[PDB]
Amino acid sequence: SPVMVLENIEPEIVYAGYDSSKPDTAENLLSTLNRLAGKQMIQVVKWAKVLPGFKNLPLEDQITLIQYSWMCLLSFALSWRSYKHTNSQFLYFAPDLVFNEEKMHQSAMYELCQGMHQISLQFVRLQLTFEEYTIMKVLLLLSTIPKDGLKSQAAFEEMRTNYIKELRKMVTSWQRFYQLTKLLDSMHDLVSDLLEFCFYTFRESHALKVEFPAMLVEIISDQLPKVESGNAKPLYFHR
C-alpha cells in the first residue's frame, strides 16, 4: 500500500533564493546551494515523519537515519527533478536555480556536478517511474546506519527488508530490480565524494567565504566530526 501514501507525502516545491545579477563565482554558488539544502531538509523531515514503518521507530532512530543519509536524499532528489523537468538535460536544484555546463563549470564543483548528472542520466535510460523512485528513496533513508547498529535495530531490518520486498513488488523483472538496486549502491560512491567536499568547505568556512545556514551546521558538525573515518556503515545490495 505505501506507494500510494508516498505520492501524497512526496515533498513539493522549494526555492533556493539567489539574488542573481553580478558575477557568481564559487563563493556564490555554494552559499546559495547550501542555503538551498537547509530548506529542503525541513521538507525531508516533514516527509520522513509520515513514512510507513519509519514513523514507528522512536524519534531517536528516525533523526539518526536522516542525519547519516541526508546527502543521499537531497542528491538522489536532485536527479529526479533534473530528470522530470529537463529530461536530465540539466541539474534542476531549484525552480530558481538551474545548472548548465557553465554553472557546473564556475561553481568550483564541476566533477561532482557531473557525477550527480550521471545519475539523472541513468534515470532517463532506465526511464524510472515515480513508483520506483519513491521506494528507492526510502531505501536511501534506510541505507546508512551507525557502524554499531540501532536501538530498534531488529525492528529496523524487518522494515527495510519489507521495503526491499516492496521495490521488487514494484519491479513486477529481476534485471530491473538489479539495475535499480545497483543504482542506489553506486549512490554510496557519489555521496562519500560529495561529503568530503562539503566537509572541507565547512572546516574552511570563513577563509573560503562559503557560508552554511544553521540547520546544516548542527548536522555536519554531527555527521563528519568523527565519522570522516568509517563509523558510517552503508548497507549495499550486491557484490
Ligand X SMILES: C[C@]12CC[C@H]3[C@@H](CCC4=CC(=O)CC[C@@]43C)[C@@H]1CC[C@@H]2C(=O)CO
* Residue facing ligand X at closest CB distance: 78
User: Does 110 contact ligand X by CB under 6 A?
Assistant: no
User: Does 32 contact ligand X by CB under 6 A?
Assistant: no
Interatomic CA distance for residues 198 and 204, integer angstroms: 10
Shortest reach from residue 162's CB to ligand X, in Å: 28
Per DSSP, the three-state class of 230 is coil
**Rule CB under 6 A: which of 124-183 touch ligand X?**
none
Shortest reach from residue 147's CB to ligand X, in Å: 23
Check if the beta carbon of residue 143 is closer than 8 Å to that of residue 235.
Answer: yes
Q: Which residue in 2, 6, 40, 224 binds ligand X (CB under 6 A)? A: 40
Shortest reach from residue 188's CB to ligand X, in Å: 14
Which range, of 4-12, 35-43, 49-57, 164-172, touches ligand X by CB under 6 A?
A: 35-43
Check if the beta carbon of residue 113 is closer than 8 Å to that of residue 127.
Answer: no
* DSSP one-letter code for 151: T
User: Does 33 contact ligand X by CB under 6 A?
Assistant: yes
Total residues binding ligand X (CB under 6 A): 17
* DSSP one-letter code for 58: -
Closest CA to 2 of 130, 156, 123, 157: 130
Closest CA to 193 of 122, 121, 110, 85: 110
Where along the sequence are the contacts to ligand X (CB under 6 A)? 30, 33-34, 36-37, 40, 74-75, 77-78, 93, 112, 194, 197-198, 201, 210
